[PDB]
Each structure stands twice: as C-alpha cells, then as structure tokens.
Design an enzyme around this catalytic site. Structure first.
Site, PDB file in Angstrom:
ATOM      1  N   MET F  39       2.314  -4.979  -2.677  1.00  0.00           N
ATOM      2  CA  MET F  39       3.270  -3.940  -2.324  1.00  0.00           C
ATOM      3  C   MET F  39       3.697  -3.189  -3.576  1.00  0.00           C
ATOM      4  SD  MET F  39       5.637  -5.967   0.455  1.00  0.00           S
ATOM      5  CE  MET F  39       4.999  -6.386   2.076  1.00  0.00           C
ATOM      6  N   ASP F  40       3.682  -1.862  -3.496  1.00  0.00           N
ATOM      7  CA  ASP F  40       4.150  -1.008  -4.575  1.00  0.00           C
ATOM      8  C   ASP F  40       5.630  -0.694  -4.362  1.00  0.00           C
ATOM      9  OD1 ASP F  40       4.415   1.693  -3.136  1.00  0.00           O
ATOM     10  OD2 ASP F  40       2.328   1.177  -2.706  1.00  0.00           O
ATOM     11  N   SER F  41       6.134   0.308  -5.084  1.00  0.00           N
ATOM     12  CA  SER F  41       7.551   0.647  -5.023  1.00  0.00           C
ATOM     13  C   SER F  41       7.995   0.932  -3.593  1.00  0.00           C
ATOM     14  CB  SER F  41       7.830   1.854  -5.917  1.00  0.00           C
ATOM     15  OG  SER F  41       7.385   1.638  -7.242  1.00  0.00           O
ATOM     16  N   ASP F  43       6.487   0.677  -0.695  1.00  0.00           N
ATOM     17  CA  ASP F  43       6.169  -0.361   0.283  1.00  0.00           C
ATOM     18  C   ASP F  43       7.170  -1.507   0.221  1.00  0.00           C
ATOM     19  OD1 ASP F  43       4.185   1.366  -0.407  1.00  0.00           O
ATOM     20  OD2 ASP F  43       2.542  -0.081  -0.219  1.00  0.00           O
ATOM     21  N   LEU F  44       7.535  -1.928  -0.991  1.00  0.00           N
ATOM     22  CA  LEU F  44       8.409  -3.084  -1.147  1.00  0.00           C
ATOM     23  C   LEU F  44       9.841  -2.768  -0.746  1.00  0.00           C
ATOM     24  CD1 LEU F  44       8.446  -5.967  -1.907  1.00  0.00           C
ATOM     25  CD2 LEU F  44       8.790  -5.342  -4.313  1.00  0.00           C
TER      26      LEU F  44
END
Ligand SMILES: CCCCCCCCCCCCCCCCCC(=O)OC[C@H](COP(=O)(O)OCCN)OC(=O)CCCCCCCCCCCCCCCCC
Ligand SMILES: CCCCCCCCCCCC(=O)OC[C@H](COP(=O)(O)OCC[N+](C)(C)C)OC(=O)CCCCCCCCCCC
Ligand SMILES: CCCCCCCCCCC[C@H](O)CC(=O)SCCNC(=O)CCNC(=O)[C@H](O)C(C)(C)COP(=O)(O)O
Ligand code: SF4
Ligand code: SF4
Lengths: 192, 126, 115, 129, 145, 93, 440, 88
Positions: F39-41, F43-44
């Site tokens: 997960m990136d920024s 997404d998280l």
C-alpha cells in the site's frame, strides 16, 4: 518657525481645553433625588414623546392618490426612449452610430444602408430596454435630436419579449409622444 | 535590574480619545522612557545610520523641554504632538523600533535589486 | 478579530519534505468528514462514493513538481476544505461538483459542426 | 501591490508600492494593521496574489467554487460560465457561457495619433543635479 | 445665526383664524410648521487655444532612485550648488554637515510629514455659540478657528 | 467502560482489511502495511481511516508518518478507546 | 481533535483493595455488574470524558432579513445570546464593477459610480470626477464647484436620512423613518429637476457638472431649508432624549480611537471615538474651503455618540446649504474646453469647430495623460476614494474603489464581540452599510 | 517558462489546447488576441438579429509593450501561439 525641531507640528497641537474635565459623582447632580425619581418613575420623556406624535395626527398627510394624480416631473426627465420625426415627415435620424458608441450598456443596435432615394437612413434600430440604464446619453448624443426620452414611465409589460423595442415600436412612440416631447424640449432649450 | 514602566493605564479619568485613560504620573515616566531611548541607541544602532541621528534630533529636544516645564499643559503645547498620554505612546513605540531597526540592519546596502523593466509604466520610463 | 473555524495561516513553505506530510494529513481530513458531507449536503451518493470521488480528486494531481506552485495548490485546496467543512457552498454546487461528466470520429464531427 | 497609509497625527498620506508575481509571496501587513484583513482577501480573490502571513485568506468577492481570478488582464470580461435553472435537475446549475448578443468591441477606432506630450516641469530646483 | 424662527417666516402651510390660537395653546413648540409646502409659492411656475490649455502641460513623471539621490548631497543643488552609485556607502563616508542641511532640516531635526493642508487648526466651542447639545451630552463641537 | 480487548480489535480488523486490495489474505499482528500489503500513501490512508470508522478512534498527525505495522494499530485502539457520553435519559432512569 | 474532545487534589496511591470475603482480584471477573465496586470516580478532572464536538448555534442573519441593507450572509456563532465570532459573507452583490470600468471610457464609466451607494449619488460620482480632474490637470470654474458643494450637502442629508432613520427603524422606532422619507421625496425632487432621474443622477461629470441649474431652483432649495429645520427637531424629540433609545445604543459597540485607526475606520466611526479628523478639512475641494461649518467629535465611541454626530451632521449640512445658496457665484458650470465637455447645441450646429469636438467626444472620448492618483473625499459613510491608473488611453486601466462600508464591516468582529444578538442590529445600523458599495 | 502555471490561473482546459493566440503589432506596441472559433463564433439570432456568440475570448485583447515580454507571458501561461512579424 515650526515645531520640526521637536518632530511636532502645529497640526499635532490639540486645541486649548481639548482634554475632558473630571466626571461627576453622585453628590454633584443638579436635580435632587426626588426630582430625578419623578421624571424616572412617571415617564416624563415618553409622555412628551407621545404628545409630539399626537401633533402629527392633526396634520394633513402628504399622500397623493395614484393613478388619479401624479407626482411632479421635470422637462429633463429620462424615461421611455423614443425616435423623433421631422414635421415634413422624414426621419430625423441619419444613422451616425454615435448612438451605438456612447451607450454605456450597449443597448443600442443600429444597422444602416443607402435608402432607395439615396438619403442616408437606417433599416434596423433596436433598443434592449432590459439592458438600458436610462442614462440619457441617447438624447445628448443626437446632432438632430432624433432619439429622445419621453416623460413616460407606465409601460410595464407581462412578457419580457415586449421590452425589445425595434424601429417600428420606437417610431410609434415618437409619433404618439410627439406633442409631449415638444413640452420637454421647448422647456429645456436654454440650458443646453 | 527588573523594571516596569506604565505605558497606558486601564482605569481612571478619560482623555477625550476613547480607550486612553489618564496617566497617573506621566511627567517623570516620560522623562524615564525618553532617557531609556538614548541608552538603546548607544547599544544597537551604528553611528552613520541617519535613523540614529534622527531619533536624537527630537528625543533630546523634547526630553529637555519636558524637564524645564512643570505644568502638564505646557509640555504638550511647546512639543505640539497632542496630549501627554499620546506623548507616552510616541516615545514607547519609537523605543521598540530602535530594537527592531537594529535587528533588520536597515543601514546597509539595498538588499534586493529591482529588475530592469519592473519600475517602468506603459513603456515610457518614469 | 477572531479567525473562523478550520483556518490556517498562509505561509510560503520552503521545504520539499514538509509539504509532503502536510498534504497527507489533509487527504485524511477529507476522508474523516466523508459521512458529514453526505449528511450536510444531502448528497444522493453514499459515503463510499464520496471517498471514491475524493480519491479520484487526490489521485488526479499528485505528480506536480514546482514547489512555488506546490504551496499555491496546497493553499487553495485548504480553502476548498474550509469552504466545504464550514458548510458554506450551497447544496446545488456540491451536487453539480460530482455530476460533471470517449470522443468521436472525424466524420461524426464533420457532419454536425465539430467545434 | 499598493499600500495607501493615513497619518491622522501629521495629516499626510503615503503609498508603499511593492511588486508581486503570480507565485512570489508578499508578507501580510496584518501584524501591523488589522484593517487589511479584508483588503488583502479582496486582492487575493480578484488577482490570486499569495499573501504571506495572512491569518485567514480566502474568497471574499467571488462565488463559492468560482474558478479563476477576475481582475487579471487575460480573464475575459464576460467570464467562462453562467447559471440557469434546470427543471429536470430541480436546482440552479452552472453552464458554459452563451451570449445572445456578444460584447461589441469599439476600441478598434481608437486614437492612432499622439495625444499628450512631456508637459511642463514643476520640480523644485533643490531636487535637481 | 440659526436661532429660533417664528412659524410665519417659514414657507409652509399655516393656520388661519382662531385655529392658530388653538394651535399655539396645545402644541409644545409653537414655532414649528406642519411641513406641507406652500402651494401658492413653492414650484408655482414649473420649469416650462494655447492660452486656455493645461492638460498638455500636466506635471511630468520623474522617479528618484538611489543613483540620483546620492547626487544631491555631493554635487549639491541646481539652485545652491555645492550608473549604480550606491547611497549606503555615501552615508557611511560623508560629512555630517552635509546631512544637517540637505538630508535633514532645522539642524538635523526630522522633517515632520508634510501636511495635506496647513491651515487645519481646531478650537473647542461652547454651547452658547453653536446652539448644539448642552455639556452633559457625550460629544464636543470643533471649529476651524 | 472500554469493552474492547486485543483479540476483539484483531478479529474485526481483518474484515476491514479483507475489504481492500491486499497482496496476501494472511494478516496478523506481525504483518506490515506498506510492505506486506503493498500500500502506498493514498491506499494506506483509506484503510487507516476505515479503522477509524469502525473502532471509533482518531489517529493524530504525530503517528501519521510513524505507522509501519498492523499490530500497532490494534494495540493503539485499546489505549485510545472510550464510550461516548450518554445523555441524562440513557444513563439514569 | 476535530470530531470530539477528551488537578488540585494529590494523586493518591491506593493499592491492595480488599473486601471482607476476599481480595480485589478474586472477584475482579465479576465486579463489573456491581456498580459499587468501580474504581473510577466521576468527579476526577482526569476522568476520561469523551464528548463529541457539537457545534454551537450558528444562526444565519442571512439575505432575507429586513435588517440587511442588501444580501448579507452574516454567519453569527452565538452561545446563548452573546456573540462569540462573526464572519460576514460579502459578495452576494459583487456585480464586478471594477472589471467593467476597464472596458469603458471615462465618460461612460461615470454612471457606474451612482450605483455603488444607492443613496449618496452625487458624492460618489464626485470622487471619480475629482480623480479624472486631478489627472486631466484641469480645474472646474467657481460656479461649477459651488453646485458640487450644494449638492454635496443635499446628498449628505439624503444619505444620513437613510442611515439614521433605518438605524432607528431597525431598533424599532417606525415613525421617524416615515417622517424623514417624505423629506427624501422632497429632496429627490431637486435631483430630478437638475439631472432628470430621481435617484441615479449622472450629473457631476469630470470637468464640472452636466447642465446648469434650472431657473428658480435656488428659491425652491432655500424654501425647503426653512421648513426642514423643524424636521430634525421632531426627530430629536422621539430619539435623542428617549430612555429606550439611549438604552439600546449607549455602551453598544465600543471602538477605541487608537483601535479605530488600526482597522482604518473613517467617517462617523472615527470621530465617534474622539479623533477630530475630517477629510473636507484635511484636503479641501470643490468650494468646501469657502464655506464654514463645525465638525462633531464624540467621547465614548458607542452607537449613541455616533447618533449625536450624525444628527449634528444634519444641521451643519443645512448650515452650508444656506451659505451655498447665498454665496452662489455667476458664470459657467463646466470647463470651457471642448475636448473635455460637449459644446452647447446652439453652437454645435453653427460652428465647424464645435461639431467636430461633439462628434469626437462621443465616439472616441478624451484621453487622460499617464499617471496614477488616489483622491479621497468625505463620503457620508466615511473616506471614499478611488485608485485610478491612466495609460494614456481613453479608457482607465485600473479603477480600485475604496468603500467606507467595506472596511467597517471588516471590523464587525472587533466591535460586536461580547454583545447580544439585539446589539448586532444596532452595530450594523450605526455602520451605515450599503452592500452595493461594500461589494463594488 | 518551465512552470505549469495553468493549474493556478483557473482557466478552462480548452485554452491550453484548442485555442490559438496571435501576437501581432497594429505601431509601437504588441498585442495578443485569440483566433476565431471554427463554428459558433457568430450566429445570427433568429429573434432580433443580435450577433450571438459562444466564444468567450472574442472581446479580449492584451496590450503589451515589447515582443519578448509578450512571448514570456504566452510561455508562462502555457498558451499555444504564433507571432506575426509586421511589414517594413
Ligand atoms: C397608588 C398609591 C400611590 C402610590 C404612590 C404614592 C405617592 C406618594 C409617595 C410617598 C412615598 C415617597 C417618599 C418621598 C418623600 C421623601 C423623598 C425624599 O425626601 O428624597 C429622599 C431623600 C434624599 O435627599 P436629597 O433630596 O437627595 O438631598 C440632597 C439633594 N442633592 O432622602 C432623605 O434624606 C429623606 C428620606 C425620608 C425617608 C422617609 C420617607
Ligand atoms: C411610587 C411611584 C410609582 C410609579 C409607577 C409607574 C412606574 C413605571 C416604571 C418606571 C420606571 C421606568 O420606566 O424605568 C425605566 C426602565 C429601567 O431603566 P434603568 O434600567 O434604571 O435605566 C435608567 C437609568 N437611570 C436611572 C440612570 C435613568 O426602562 C425603561 O426605559 C422602560 C420603558 C417603559 C416604557 C413603557 C411605555 C408604556 C406607556 C404607557 C402609557 C401610554
Ligand atoms: C464533498 C466534496 C469533496 C470535494 C473534494 C475536493 C478535493 C480537492 C482536491 C485537492 C487538489 C489539490 O489542489 C492538490 C493536492 O491535493 S496536493 C498534492 C500535490 N502533490 C505535490 O505537489 C507533490 C507531493 N506529492 C505527494 O506527496 C504524493 O503525490 C501524494 C500526495 C500522493 C502522497 O501520497 P504517497 O506518496 O503515495
Ligand atoms: S438611455 Fe443611455 S443606456 Fe439607455 S439606450 Fe440610451 S444611451 Fe443606452
Ligand atoms: S445620434 Fe441621432 S441621428 Fe445619430 S444615430 Fe442616434 S438617433 Fe440617429
């Protein structure tokens, strides 16, 4: 010499006696305690306020009875735009487009060409009375007094389409209001 | 040294101007703050800074005129810069500027030079 | 003078890294108020839809590069947050905000009038 | 960016003029004058100028969600969109601009000649070389 | 001086007959008019090149920067004679006796901001003069002296 | 009182995590967020906000850049769980 | 945080809780039911209380309110009846005047200024006329500047009647509103006789006035002056000494003179606070130096003081009207330069030079020499000024308008804080708001 | 020049791509205006013969001072443009 030595001015000098005096205390009131209480408890100023209102009840009201009477008007009144006409019958307007240029709200639309007789006239002349501001530059711009504003104001219409004045509507008013415009111009001739 | 100088009071008699109460003991407090101004120049602002020369040109002039005159009215009239209460404000806020002006180092060369075309209006040079 | 709810000072940020963290918190702030935006403006779309549109808004313009133009984009997005959270935009503007929006061949554009 | 100041004490006015770009910020004068809190918001709203240190800067003269800053030279005088009422949507909706009569441009017949020259000097001689 | 004026000196509708004396007994202030205008006088008759040029001689636009500013202290003035030439260095090395006459006025005393009108001088007035509110009312009247 | 235990947070955490695109369906305390789930920024943030909607606990800005594992969030809820104050009608009658 | 929120006595160490039938831990797994076994007292300041942030009552003093002088979404945040924070939402009348002037000539841009303030017309267009005159480097003759002084006063009477009486009406005194509006009808007759339209008189044009005064106007102006003197007296009868009017206004909206300067207030809400400054005196203009009048200065900086100043402005204005009628000079009414004024119609059709300038004035307009200016005048609200940049063209380049009602409304938060909701109406009334001028 | 200022000017997407601006010189200064639309620039209204229009840039002209100043502006806004050299 000025007060520039002290970085001050005669302007910065407050007038003599500018500062407030000392405020009064309860022992320094002219009206005794009973005198102030009677005015306070018996509503002296309110009852005076009531009486002065009752004075106006016995005066003639300013009201006038519209539409059976009208308010005053002046020969300079700016109302319904109207296209004037010569006594000989030929249109006064020669299509400057001075009209289309001055109009602050861009409410004047003129298109012109050579007439059949060759004299310069216009076949399109429209005013968007919903866009006009009744400024008065109509009347001032004319070198032949062809467009003037009548003293009429009672021309409210149900549909907004009726407020787009084409040439024929303007010419109809010019004939319909001609004698009244004679009152306006001949009473405002000296001051122009 | 821990001192406290009364700038403006919060109660007492009004002075015409709203929110400006009458100062209790203005005359020596004006003399004290005026004197403290000249001390601040001697510590922070360099000699050639014409702002330093401009402060003394009226601080010494006024402060000397205050001491000779013993009537509060005569202090205002000859200085000619409003009330006594206002004269406190003028001395106090000028004192802070001496602290701030030295911090800025506004005696130096022009920090940021304008571009060529910046100060020309409609083609013709001003 | 007392500044209004959800206000921030307008500051010219002189760091690349700090702006990254400011944005990340901001994106969470929109998602935290996802339920409110539905109930405040009476939007027809459910809470998950708004987050989906907000994500489509934040995903859209993440690749900007100019820091002087980063602050401007962060400044105005703050105003959009402040206007929306304080319930300032009318109901109609939010409904039309999410109601906005493949091309056609040359023959199709030639016939009707193109542009 | 202009700054007109008033001195009630000394009875004079001054004009501080500091340039600004579309991106270069200008420090806010709120810490000096609280009266520019609304004069700066107008300047930002109508120009987009970025004011550094404003306690709360936002739209003050344009509509909520308005796009663009109007008093710029490249911003058209008629705007980009205008609103109307759409019965099917049952709300007042923005729509792309449409003019039944376009703004006629009469500047074309402007002056082609010079109007005003240098004028007559009035500089006091104490401020000359 | 705007002192009290009787009713019969004001162009307004009055009272004719004994009603005048009735009015003067009931009304609190007998010298006030009903306000209705005089129909018999008010609006009775209805309304029915170089020698003279200055715009071309408008004051010019001249800007004084640090380069030209330094030139007045060193060279002097065009009345009393005495590239990038920075002022800050000039203030660092120049005679203060130049300052006390050119850069400053009246022996180095700072120049008070020039008044937009010098003759704005005020004096406090009194009730018997301006005919306004008495002293207890929380205002004061100023005049041009 | 705070009726949440560690297991209760852990059991319900997976269901929210099973509702988002995760590289592996095996998630426990040791499982990370950026690494294991990829997960990136953006997404998280959605998952972190989603756990705020279920556990009803707000995560501050200090912990924003300091979250690296899913066990920390599960343990964080216990330290920061309170029941919303009930009006005078609910409490005593 | 954003959605919800969460000592004197000694922190007392108590451990080893026991009952008579065991220990604390022996019955720990059962004591939750027993409400008398809890160990978290509810009076403790550190006791965990988690309450949602329910927002305070935010009534909208919105557009559809009679108190509003236009369309003002005054977002008022109040707890109980006191005023915590106020955030006026101006812009509901942003017609974009400053944008439109840039595309119209200097003569065509005059009618825009009468539409800024609906009641103070000839003062509004006077500040643009002065701005253009300052750039044009041409000065109006004497009789022109006397007409602008006379109608400067009449306008002030017209504006203050709208300002004071509506302020009195918004408090609740309906009667003085109607007594004064007849005078406005009587005063608007004078506007209509000289210019033609009752309200928006495009009369004061750059370079003097539009047309000379009609004959006999002075007789009718003066006749109203005698009658008008009583009208203030009755207005002062039902307002000045009434105790209900004093209660509603005394001590309401206190503005310090030092703090009034900070927010840039001007007009009545700067002499209400004690500062004896007036623009008609600081910068004389248009035959104001010739006349004599007394300015009014308050001492308490509240609504009742500003009322007394405004009432004094009635009599002082009436004082000048007598002087302007008496001291009226003869001569022209506009600058005798055909390039900045239309030639008379008797001469336009007779002289080739006259017709050319008439034709050229109305098609291209006159060109203003380059420069910039900021001329401020004493508008009835306060200091009204225009910033005008001349680019050598027949159309101004930048036209920024300083509205006295704009700055005052900004200081609403500083003034209204700590007062009650009825005091909000009193504060708005004494600000003399006309949101056409605010949102220019 | 390298700055994507179009994200701060608030202009619609069509100005960047579908419009062309001419940098001409009418006799001492340069001007910028947008070339007319293909269709819908001017259609005769069927009610009163008004010159209707959908182009919102028809009435816009920017008076510049120097050529390079105008080119700097066009690159700053991300505007497609071409330059017309006046005849000597
Ligand atoms: C419906 C039925 C009718 C109801 C209303 C009846 C109407 C009649 C009312 C009768 C009662 C009212 C009493 C009024 C008589 C006393 C008033 C008075 O003397 O004033 C109070 C007095 C204050 O002294 P002062 O006048 O202020 O002297 C200093 C002046 N600078 O203080 C004093 O020193 C004397 C106080 C005397 C105390 C006993 C009384
Ligand atoms: C023994 C004697 C018996 C008298 C009996 C009658 C007493 C009546 C009340 C007196 C006190 C008073 O009206 O007081 C005024 C009160 C309170 O004023 P306050 O807060 O003290 O402020 C004043 C502070 N001073 C002392 C410094 C001045 O407010 C008011 O303005 C109320 C206005 C009421 C208006 C009612 C109009 C009805 C008209 C009826 C006929 C048409
Ligand atoms: C109900 C109404 C709803 C209405 C809803 C309204 C939504 C408003 C949209 C806001 C748009 C705003 O102008 C632009 C912005 O968000 S600022 C991000 C720009 N970015 C940079 O300038 C460089 C730094 N970039 C990063 O840090 C990463 O790209 C990222 C932010 C993705 C972190 O994520 P991580 O690295 O994966
Ligand atoms: S009166 Fe003025 S605004 Fe109206 S159509 Fe004539 S020129 Fe235009
Ligand atoms: S000014 Fe008179 S003649 Fe000329 S176009 Fe207008 S109406 Fe016709």
């Amino acid at each position: 010499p000025t007060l520039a030595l002290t970085s001050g001015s005669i302007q910065g000098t407050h007038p003599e006696g500018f500062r407030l005096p000392r405020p009064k205390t309860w022992e320094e009131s002219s009206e005794s305690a009973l005198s102030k209480a009677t005015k306070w408890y018996l509503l002296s100023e309110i009852f005076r306020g009531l009486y002065i209102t009752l004075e106006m009840y016995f005066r003639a009201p300013y009201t006038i009875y519209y539409p059976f009477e009208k308010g005053p008007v002046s020969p300079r009144f700016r109302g319904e735009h109207a296209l004037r006409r010569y006594p000989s019958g030929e249109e006064r307007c020669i299509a400057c487009k001075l009209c289309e240029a001055v109009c602050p709200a861009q409410a004047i639309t003129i298109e012109a060409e050579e007439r059949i007789d060759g004299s310069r006239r216009t076949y399109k002349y429209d005013i968007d009375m919903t866009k006009c501001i009744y400024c008065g530059y109509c009347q001032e711009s004319c070198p032949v007094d062809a467009i003037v504003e009548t003293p009429n104001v009672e021309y409210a219409t149900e549909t907004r389409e009726e407020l787009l004045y084409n040439k024929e509507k303007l010419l109809a008013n010019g004939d319909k209001w001609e004698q009244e415009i004679q009152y306006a111009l001949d009473a405002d001739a000296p001051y122009r | 040294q821990a001192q406290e100088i009364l700038i403006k009071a919060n109660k007492g008699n009004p002075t015409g101007l709203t929110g400006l109460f009458q100062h209790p003991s203005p005359r020596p407090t004006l003399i004290t703050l005026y004197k403290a101004t000249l001390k601040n120049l001697e510590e922070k602002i360099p000699k050639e800074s014409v702002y330093r020369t401009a402060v003394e040109a009226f601080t010494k002039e006024r402060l000397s005129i205050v001491e000779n005159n013993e009537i509060i009215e005569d202090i205002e009239k000859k200085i000619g810069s409003g009330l006594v209460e206002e004269l406190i404000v003028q001395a106090n806020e000028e004192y802070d500027l001496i602290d701030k002006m030295a911090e800025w180092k506004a005696w130096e060369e022009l920090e940021e030079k304008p571009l060529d075309d910046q100060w020309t209006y409609f083609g013709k040079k001003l | 003078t007392n500044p209004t709810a959800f206000a921030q000072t307008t500051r010219y940020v002189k760091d690349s890294t700090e702006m990254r963290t400011l944005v990340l918190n901001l994106y969470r702030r929109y998602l935290r108020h996802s339920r409110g935006f539905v109930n405040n403006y009476n939007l027809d779309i459910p809470a998950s839809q708004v987050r989906t549109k907000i994500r489509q808004e934040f995903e859209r313009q993440r690749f900007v590069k100019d820091l002087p133009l980063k602050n401007v984009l962060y400044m105005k997005a703050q105003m959009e947050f402040q206007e929306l959270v304080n319930f300032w935009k009318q109901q109609c503007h939010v409904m039309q905000y999410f109601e906005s929006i493949k091309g056609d061949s040359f023959v199709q554009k030639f016939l009707k009038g193109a542009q | 960016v202009v700054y007109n100041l008033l001195s009630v004490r000394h009875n004079s006015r001054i004009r501080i003029k500091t340039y600004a770009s579309e991106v270069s910020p200008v420090p806010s004068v709120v810490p000096l004058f609280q009266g520019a809190n609304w004069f700066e918001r107008e300047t930002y709203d109508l120009f987009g100028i970025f004011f550094e240190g404003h306690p709360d800067l936002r739209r003050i003269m344009t509509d909520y969600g308005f796009q663009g800053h109007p008093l710029r030279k490249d911003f058209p005088t008629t705007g980009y969109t205008e609103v109307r009422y759409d019965a099917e949507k049952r709300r007042v909706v923005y729509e792309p601009l449409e003019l039944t009569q376009a703004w006629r441009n009469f500047t074309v017949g402007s002056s082609v000649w010079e109007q005003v020259g240098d004028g007559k000097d009035f500089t006091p001689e104490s401020f000359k070389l | 001086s705007g002192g009290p004026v009787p009713v019969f000196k004001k162009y307004t509708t009055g009272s004719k007959g004994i009603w005048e004396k009735i009015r003067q007994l009931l009304t609190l202030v007998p010298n006030r008019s009903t306000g209705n205008p005089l129909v018999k006088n008010y609006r009775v008759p209805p309304p029915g090149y170089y020698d003279r040029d200055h715009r071309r001689n408008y004051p010019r636009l001249v800007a004084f920067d640090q380069t030209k500013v330094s030139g007045l202290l060193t060279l002097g003035s065009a009345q009393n004679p005495r590239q990038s030439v920075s002022l800050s260095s000039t203030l660092a090395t120049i005679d203060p006796k130049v300052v006390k006459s050119e850069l400053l006025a009246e022996g180095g005393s700072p120049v008070v901001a020039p008044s937009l009108n010098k003759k704005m001088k005020f004096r406090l007035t009194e009730e018997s003069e301006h005919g306004m509110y008495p002293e207890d009312y929380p205002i004061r009247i100023f005049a041009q002296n | 009182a705070s009726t949440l235990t560690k297991e209760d947070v852990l059991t319900r955490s997976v269901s929210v995590l099973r509702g988002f695109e995760v590289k592996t369906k095996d998630i426990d305390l040791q499982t990370t967020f950026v690494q294991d789930l990829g997960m990136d920024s953006l997404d998280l943030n959605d998952a972190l906000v989603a756990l705020e909607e279920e556990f009803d606990v707000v995560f501050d800005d200090k912990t924003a850049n300091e979250i690296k594992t899913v066990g920390e969030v599960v343990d964080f809820v216990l330290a920061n769980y309170l029941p919303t104050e009930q009006s005078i009608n609910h409490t005593i009658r | 945080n954003d959605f919800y929120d969460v000592n004197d006595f000694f922190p007392v160490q108590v451990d080893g809780i026991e009952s008579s039938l065991g220990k604390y831990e022996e019955f720990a797994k059962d004591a939750h039911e027993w409400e008398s076994w809890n160990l978290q007292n509810e009076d403790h300041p550190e006791y965990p209380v988690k309450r949602t942030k329910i927002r305070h009552f935010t009534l909208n003093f919105g557009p559809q309110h009679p108190a509003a002088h236009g369309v003002l979404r005054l977002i008022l945040e109040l707890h109980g009846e006191e005023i915590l924070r106020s955030d006026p939402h101006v812009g509901l009348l942003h017609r974009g005047t400053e944008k439109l002037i840039e595309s119209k000539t200097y003569m065509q841009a005059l009618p825009y200024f009468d539409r800024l303030d609906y009641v103070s017309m000839m003062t509004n267009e006077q500040v643009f006329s002065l701005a253009v005159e300052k750039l044009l480097n041409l000065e109006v003759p004497e009789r022109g500047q006397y007409i602008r002084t006379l109608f400067g006063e009449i306008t002030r009477v017209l504006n203050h009647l709208m300002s004071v009486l509506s302020h009195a009406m918004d408090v609740g005194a309906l009667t003085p509103f109607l007594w004064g509006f007849e005078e406005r009808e009587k005063l608007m007759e004078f506007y209509e006789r000289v210019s033609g339209a009752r309200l928006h008189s495009a009369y004061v044009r750059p370079g003097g006035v539009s047309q000379d005064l009609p004959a006999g106007l002075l007789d009718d102006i003066y006749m109203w002056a005698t009658q008008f003197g009583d009208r203030l007296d009755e207005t002062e009868e039902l307002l000045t000494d009434s105790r209900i009017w004093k209660q509603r206004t005394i001590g309401i909206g206190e503005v310090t003179a030092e703090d009034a300067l900070n927010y840039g207030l001007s007009g009545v809400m700067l002499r209400g606070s004690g500062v004896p400054f007036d623009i008609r005196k600081s910068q004389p203009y248009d035959a104001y130096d010739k006349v004599d009048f007394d300015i009014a200065v308050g001492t308490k900086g509240d609504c009742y003081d500003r009322y007394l100043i405004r009432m004094t402005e009635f009599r002082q204005s009436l004082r000048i009207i007598e002087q302007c009628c008496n001291q009226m000079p003869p001569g022209p009414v506009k600058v005798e330069d055909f390039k900045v004024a239309p030639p008379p119609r008797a001469l336009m059709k007779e002289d080739m030079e006259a017709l050319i300038h008439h034709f050229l004035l109305y098609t291209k307009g006159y060109a203003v020499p380059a420069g910039e200016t900021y001329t401020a005048i004493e508008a009835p609200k306060g200091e009204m000024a225009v910033y005008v940049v001349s680019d050598g063209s027949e159309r101004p380049y930048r036209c920024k308008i300083r509205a006295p009602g704009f700055a005052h409304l900004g200081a609403f938060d500083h003034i209204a804080r700590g007062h009650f909701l009825p005091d909000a109406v009193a504060i708005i009334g004494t600000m003399d708001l006309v949101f056409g001028e605010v949102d220019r | 020049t390298d700055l994507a200022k179009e994200l701060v000017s608030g202009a619609p997407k069509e100005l960047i791509t579908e419009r062309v601006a001419r940098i001409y010189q009418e006799t001492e200064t340069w001007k910028i205006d947008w070339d007319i639309l293909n269709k819908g620039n001017r259609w005769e209204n069927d009610l009163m013969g008004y010159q209707s229009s959908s182009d919102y840039m028809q009435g816009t002209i920017l008076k510049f001072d120097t050529r390079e100043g105008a080119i700097r502006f066009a690159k700053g806004q991300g505007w497609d443009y071409y330059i017309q050299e006046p005849k000597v």
